[PDB]
Amino acid sequence: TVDGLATAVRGGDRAALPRAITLVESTRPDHREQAQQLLLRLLPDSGNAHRVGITGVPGVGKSTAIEALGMHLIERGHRVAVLAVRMARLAVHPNAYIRPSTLGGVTRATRETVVLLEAAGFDVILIETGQSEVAVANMVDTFVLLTLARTGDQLQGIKKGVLELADIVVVNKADGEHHKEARLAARELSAAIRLIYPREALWRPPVLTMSAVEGRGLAELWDTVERHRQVLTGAGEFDARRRDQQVDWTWQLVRDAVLDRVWSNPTVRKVRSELERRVRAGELTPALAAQQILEIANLTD
Amino acid sequence: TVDGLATAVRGGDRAALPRAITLVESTRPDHREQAQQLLLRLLPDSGNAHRVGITGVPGVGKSTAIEALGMHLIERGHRVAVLAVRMARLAVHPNAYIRPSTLGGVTRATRETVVLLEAAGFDVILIETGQSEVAVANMVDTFVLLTLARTGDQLQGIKKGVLELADIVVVNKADGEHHKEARLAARELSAAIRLIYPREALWRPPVLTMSAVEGRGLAELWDTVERHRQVLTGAGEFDARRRDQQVDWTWQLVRDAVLDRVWSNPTVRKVRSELERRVRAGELTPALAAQQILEIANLTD
Ligand SMILES: Nc1nc2c(ncn2[C@@H]2O[C@H](COP(=O)(O)OP(=O)(O)O)[C@@H](O)[C@H]2O)c(=O)[nH]1
Ligand SMILES: Nc1nc2c(ncn2[C@@H]2O[C@H](COP(=O)(O)OP(=O)(O)O)[C@@H](O)[C@H]2O)c(=O)[nH]1
């Protein structure tokens, strides 16, 4: 009934999707293996969606923007899924799907859930965010960064480096007392994006203003998301980026499988503090501690 | 004579350093092991130096700045080593040491060379730079980024993300027709550093101007390097950063040892293109290709 579970998802049965999602989220050894066979069957029905990541600090307005962008999209004929690596009026619609979420684990489960959703007819996948930003950037076509409409304080609370992940930057809460400040805060971020992408010819991250609580700027945000994709498609980079993500994910799964044998080893985990204390104190070289970790892992595996 | 090779390096014998460096750079299995024992003996004589990384695009002026900074330091009583991951007038001095350089390999060899040099009495280590910037940032106390004194073009050619590695940013070639442009180019970079470190309280990367060919700005660069260190020491972060680098390096060596069994496997390497082509075409899931890579590695090891 895995062959059966695949025709039901592809045919649009909507009690079968939660179950296939449950199967994909399971890690019991018997489940991963059928989860794999299902994905394999549904994979050629995937890929026909725009995957958008969305990040920014708690309270920047992420879930308010997603709810509104979700409504905007549904009213335009899309079927929208929201995943997390809050929004009630979205969740009511028969054309929306909202599901709540170890980074390797949740990445795997999210990634595999996307294949299911795309096979199931969803054409827009919104994925909301520790090292979780990179993980989501690596599984989406357009990575969106929401920031604060405060001149000199846009990236408050943002891990450094995250700005370079963004295909689009959005100065949110451009309302109330900060209509004019929003514009200046945006122009400040543009200036910086211009220094970080000084001779980019294909896509330099545009910076938008938004008021996700007043529903202002979501349409323009989406117009920009579509534009990102027409630009990348016209240069052959859109499929090229996806194929490169799937190859990097493959090598990452290989990396995780082979390193978890070590990291996950109980003996390695008891002895870890002491070998580290010794390294930090220069009582032991890192090559020698590394060897000891390996010998020990190898004795108890 | 490994116990002998350690008292000769620590005592300041200067034909013994090249030889210990040669021993540390060797990967023949019999050599790594004595290299380790030597490092272990010299490790308590290391740590008494300021390690500075230096990066920027080819032609930005790196090796001209290093030669001049080197002379500045030697005339002030330091013993200076330069490593690379060009400068002849430096290389003549009995208080300078210049040595030319697989990323894991060259990182290991550089890192181990630093211990030797510090044991040998060198108190300033300059390390000049693919993913080589992160590697050097992870092995130094102060990471310096040289950029161009061109308004709107400072980071031309720089991999994105590298700006967030810098403890210090230096607008170089602030001479000739660009004295005033240099000042503005610097103020542009300050504005961006201010957006990326909007509420930093301990150390916000200062941005300096320099003319490394006219010997202008090197002294101020070094004053800033020393200041970086007094600031970090006053907060207990200077040793804390070093100890965290040695622990991360340990886990990296463990990661490299365990993954090279796979990556380095000849059979894995023949079959790689085809498994990738299959992943990129959606003929195969990444979890299933990952498994096939592992089974195959495991059959031929
Ligand atoms: N003034 C203003 N408040 C907003 C805006 N968007 C969200 N908020 C408020 O900020 C708080 C957090 O918003 P939320 O969507 O939950 O942010 P999240 O943590 O990123 O999901 C809520 O009280 C929202 O009403 C906006 O555009 N303007
Ligand atoms: N005008 C000017 N030229 C410089 C400066 N520093 C280096 N150069 C020139 O730029 C070229 C490359 O300098 P170099 O030190 O080799 O750069 P590197 O590739 O980063 O090592 C040489 O012709 C230098 O003379 C400077 O401050 N001003």
Curated annotation (Swiss-Prot), chains A, B:
Entry binding sites for GTP: 56-64, 175, 211-213
EC number(s) on file: 3.6.-.-
Keywords tagged on the record: ATP-binding, Chaperone, GTP-binding, Hydrolase, Nucleotide-binding
UniProt cross-references to Pfam families, sorted A to Z: MeaB
Family: Belongs to the SIMIBI class G3E GTPase family. ArgK/MeaB subfamily.
Function field: Probable GTPase. May also bind and hydrolyze ATP. May function as chaperone.
PANTHER family: METHYLMALONIC ACIDURIA TYPE A PROTEIN, MITOCHONDRIAL, METHYLMALONYL-COA MUTASE
Protein name (database record): Probable GTPase Rv1496
The organism of origin for this protein: Mycobacterium tuberculosis (strain ATCC 25618 / H37Rv)
